């Protein structure tokens, strides 16, 4: 789908409002939220894995966030 | 006086020794310039026009399949062949299908099967490219004449429109009564139309990155193609189904118009219906005020009475506008206008509409001024009958220095290193600052290309955290960290 | 003989003491059941039908905006108001635009603007739900009669068709010459239709997860709706634009049909045009063979000469089909048939077409048999005139046991705990294996729900690595990661 | 977009071939590979950050793979 | 003489070098101004009118429900639909109710139910906003003319009414016999009407904080609304009851008028019935005495006798008033009036009604004076028949100093930093006190916005206790706590 | 209810008497007073909890006063 390769991060943005800017700002943050609420099992498995792999708490939280963001 | 009312209004003060100032004009913004002996000019970039566009490629967004044809082979006999596999009007695919005695085959096993279908685009989107040389920028220059109907007026002929092309990029405008203004613009350095596509879908248009446009996973024709019989990558718009390894069929995928609208998220919409009109982007210009002159500077001051015909009104930038009408004699004359304390001991604020005059007695005059923060008194005319108007300005100078800092930060975010040109007078610190920003803009503009604002926020926090944990390398990464966190908060996508 | 030629073919051997066996019939698959002194039978689930679907929700995928109106309000004076904001057929939005004297506003600042347009659906898709009691499964039961046109024949009336509904646990079929077959199936434990939606879009249809369907970001109507105009979350299909805080516009997003097809990627396509027909999923059945009887169990042996009329052909599962014709006298009679070693000392191969009989002399007989690996003699008829046919079977028992292990693993990857029912004779180890699969599968399903196959592969590599660097935990994590890795390779998406 | 929430991982999969089984198989990995081939400078930075954050080579490679995968998906 | 009798009365004495004095006129207060060779004046802000109010918002305080409709849906079949859900006039709520065979449903479980009713406002309240340039302050300037019916007379035409607006800093009034009074007032800093709403309920009106008014949890319409029916947050005025999950009913809540009277507790009541009239707040004014002259200075002293026609009476501020009638010849003449000790050696008190004159013989004259504390003698007329009237004043300079310090502290509590302008002649210790007050006032206003007086008392005790148990920090916190406690004791809510 | 959000502490008070200044003055004090007399059990539990949470008698008295004031207000 073309929808999976949006026109984001292209360095053509001006002060002019872009096409679906207000909509598409949080759509990925709302999508991940809907998914975590629908699939807590993975988020629980993602926490245990992020705890085990990461040594420091920064690594753990970073691995957890990345895992949770890749999964949906 | 056209700038008055626009929230993206910028005040540029001071010319260089050469009586010039560098300004950047953004679509939707507007610049008010004023130098010591010069008239105040409003500048708005109101139209970017791209002329003589060439189609780069048509993408197919809605297709229909016709003329489905299948061929089969018995197992161990390799792949079957259809005549349509060499016809570029047909999309084809090979699969395997169980064969045996029940299928008319002497052997048992996977036989090759090929399904083809003729591909017909029903709706397409066109991506056009314009050469940088065919751009035409329109700039309107409105002097602060005080004319009655000129405040925030864009539906009139108060200002002078100049056209700027990469060929005739230096042009002069005779501002009637105000001498001549010269604009030396650089229309090749605002937007790089060699890297851009003017993407037209059904009735809407977008300015999009050229490499992203060529990477679109849709069927496409070269711009020269007139028949529509050689669609490249037709498989992006169809799917072949062999549910139970028994029979292959092909179906056209649905219309991709709404998926393309999603795909166009962080792109800027343009107009490609009445010509290719862009109302986005900027133009960097060198404004030459040498031949500018204040109008009516030989006039004597008015000695009659004035009346307020439109009450003082504050604008979004801390300036006030008032419309007064003259009632005395001696028109044309200079309007006595000051902003003073209550005792009229000190001069507290300045004019934006420098040298306000009365051209005709019965024509009201609009005057913009910048009062200090707090209490101040707008004193108009000379006694007897002198107008004294109380005005209070909320805020403080400290908060104004924060708003000015944020407005400059946001400009560097939008314009990058072009922001160093915005009110430049050609100093060494500006050249050094712009050169460093061009280099950090290259190292940053390559590391963060293709990344969303959330990914910028995350990386900004990660980078900041590494800096807070490891002093030379620590301050450097926290700076990159907090600049990345700012650019993630400021970017639109 | 209908199973012969299908690659997804299973052989279920033996019944329980109560003369039953449990089978799971999948769409696109086929089960061949054999038992001592029972006729061989072929079972195919060829149709699942859903009746009386209720509409759960319509979604708009293509809309049209009309009647666009707008209203403004001067700054500090609150919200603008359109009369259309009272009607929910109108999609509306409140934004801010710059205001000032040039806009007919005595004040400067951000004023309220409201844009409303009438939203009208052009194309919608419907989600339908069916009650499990309204399912009907069609099973075709074809015996191994050896009839001339029966090998892999899914068109003729060789087999018996039976309907399995929840309204009767017992389905009986009279197979002429074979007695009666009794099947007790589980039409409520196949696909869980209480968790599923029958999604019909333009001319295609999919079986989808019900909660996924209720989370689709499109404008929707409840299935109970009759007006067809009060769409919920119309904003998912429109976009308002305020490019420079000067004017607010609204435009409908394009057709989302193509995007829905991308959304439908990992779902199963079904039919809903003329009846709700599903050709996916499984049916667990208990096959009762007690009333089955070998056809021509009471025939004497053929003593005359046979001739091969279609040469031995190997199927994908290592069995061989041959068609022979009786030339002798005494029809109907029982064909002498044996697979022997090269010494003609041991019988090495079992029949699949058990008790092959000649019914009419001039009607040839198809005989499927499973020879051993290596060389063997297919012996047909009695002496004199005995046919002695050489056959070599490639492979080995070691390779077959590995292929049986993978088919078993793949059946578990698809059926889950139901795979323990597949050739089940009610044994105590199978009920234990099923119960442990149900608890491990429930836990595994909660932890890997929603993730794609690439994520399961990543997680499998991660968990296997945490076990390889760990103890009893080291064999547990390596087992869990390896099964996870296998399931990521096996799952379609 | 609905295309952002595809019907993957729902537990309804049978032996029947799903709607876009071929495309829904390697599209994401091809999208990641096309993205890296268009944005090598982020991949260099992600590699640099992964190495800095990870204390072990397993963590670093896991952080790198996730950052590289997350970035074209977050768009 | 209009101030004489007002408890909230202030004596401002002395002018600056520029012959001006800053005063703050409050509603319900009054200021008497004195200067060496100037007439004594009384100043009262008596009316603040707001003109041309725009409606910011209407709020429904009493509604009714009609046309109640309901619709149910079987479990698992989604949501019920009522057509009224499309009309925003209707308030609607979705809930769940037990469904089953008794309810006419084929399934058991929670089925969706929707209830809708038509919402109609019966009574609403409107909040209006006025621009600061549409304020008109009425000040009455009353000279101490000694006129017979002038003392405390607010119902007569004794003073001169002047209208202070933002349209003119300078207001000038002719005082017949006293020259001209010039007032340059500050109408744009009395109240911040850009932060205020004029709230009108049934027959009463309040001046309310704009953000408080915009946060009121009631159904509302924009001030732009003209239909009167598309009420926002209607559910604030209705309740849906589903007590036993059998049935959903909707009922309207009672009149919120009394509940709104509780909400308006700390607000100040105004008059919006016949024009927006405010009798609350203050006006800062600079009083220019350049053109003020005493009246009747070219008269000779009276020679005849005086008789006391209204005995000496003390005011609440330690001044005295007396009414005398001239019995002699030579009117108009100056009244001989001193306050002396018993020996008539030392002059002990001063006149408030400076240069008292008889304008007409039969017209008695009211004379205000400030006697010393203790024994004083009021000498009226000359011999023969000179009145000598003993007066005793209770109190002391120490008690008057403390009461002055409490009146000044009370003025700071009410006016904030504006209190520093109250008798200001322009000193630098008044300029520094005012600027420091603006700083500590902004930090205090931000820290105690929204808390009641009992919370101010709690925090004051807590901060005092922190300071008491802390040397430099101890004094700085005990002081903040003590001032916080004083302000908590003085604030009305 | 609107009655729960009174126009108190808004910084618009003048010397003019406000709408229910005498009324509103001690309502909250009288309201807390009646509540303690109707619910003395909670006030004991509040006193016990305050003594336990706080280390110093200033902490303990403050926690008791705040807990006694919050109890009839969260209602
Ligand atoms: C492990 C070796 C198990 C050998 C085996 O039984 O093969 C298959 C069992 O395979 C498995 O259980 C998967 C085991 C994975 C090995 C790791 C039989 O599969 P089936 O046809 O579904 O069962 C019907 C039997 N009547
Ligand atoms: C010690 C300060 C005593 C003092 O100055 O009295 C008053 C000042 O009071 C204060 O400053 C409060 C000081 C609090 C100390 C306790 C005068 O205030 P005013 O009535 O507004 O006078 C204005 C000029 N006409
Ligand atoms: C607090 C943080 C706010 C500070 C904002 C700093 C301004 C940086 C904004 C900026 O220029 N961002 C980027 C704009 O890119 P684009 O407009 O798409 O071509 C910029 O090109 C890339 C990296 C930021 C480099 C900023 C270096 C400033 C150099 C100053 C020379 C001394
Ligand atoms: C080396 C290769 C590893 C062979 C993997 C063994 C087969 C695993 C297949 C399997 O059971 N998949 C899953 C099927 O679930 P679904 O189709 O979505 O309803 C299964 O539910 C999840 C995890 C597998 C747990 C294995 C259960 C075995 C219990 C044995 C008790 C005796
Ligand atoms: C014994 C204790 C009596 C202490 C009385 C101190 C007077 C403070 C009165 C006061 O200014 N209160 C407040 C009035 O609030 P609002 O009228 O609603 O804006 C005020 O704005 C906030 C804090 C008062 C800070 C006191 C400023 C002192 C200036 C020092 C310059 C010498
Ligand atoms: C497609 O089908 C139509 C109708 O049968 C036929 O006229 C046409 O020639 C076909 N085209 C091809 C390329 O086979
Ligand atoms: C803008 O200028 C034109 C030209 O005179 C005038 O007709 C029009 O009324 C002006 N508009 C405003 C809003 O002042
Ligand atoms: C929409 O516009 C059409 C065009 O004439 C008009 O007939 C119709 O009444 C409009 N609808 C509404 C709801 O105003
Ligand atoms: C299938 O069986 C039917 C029924 O007699 C027969 O007519 C047909 O020829 C058979 N087809 C094959 C391929 O054997
Ligand atoms: C409401 O009910 C009245 C009868 O009481 C009826 O006449 C009217 O048409 C109804 N209105 C709506 C909008 O249902
Ligand atoms: C106030 O003055 C008016 C005007 O002369 C007079 O009629 C009235 O009686 C006076 N009232 C008092 C109480 O002095």
Numbering used by the authors:
A (entry chain b): 90 to 161
B (entry chain B), C (entry chain C), E (entry chain A): 1 to 470, 473 to 495
D (entry chain c), F (entry chain a): 90 to 164
What does the paper say about this structure?
Flaviviruses are positive-strand RNA viruses with enveloped virus particles. The E protein is responsible for attachment to target cells and mediates fusion between the viral and cellular membranes during entry. During the transit of the virion through the secretory pathway, acidification and cleavage of prM into pr and M induce large rearrangements of the spike at the viral surface, ultimately resulting in antiparallel homodimers arranged in a characteristic herringbone pattern. The C-terminal domain forms a stem consisting of three membrane-proximal helices (E-H1, E-H2 and E-H3) and two transmembrane helices (E-T1 and E-T2).
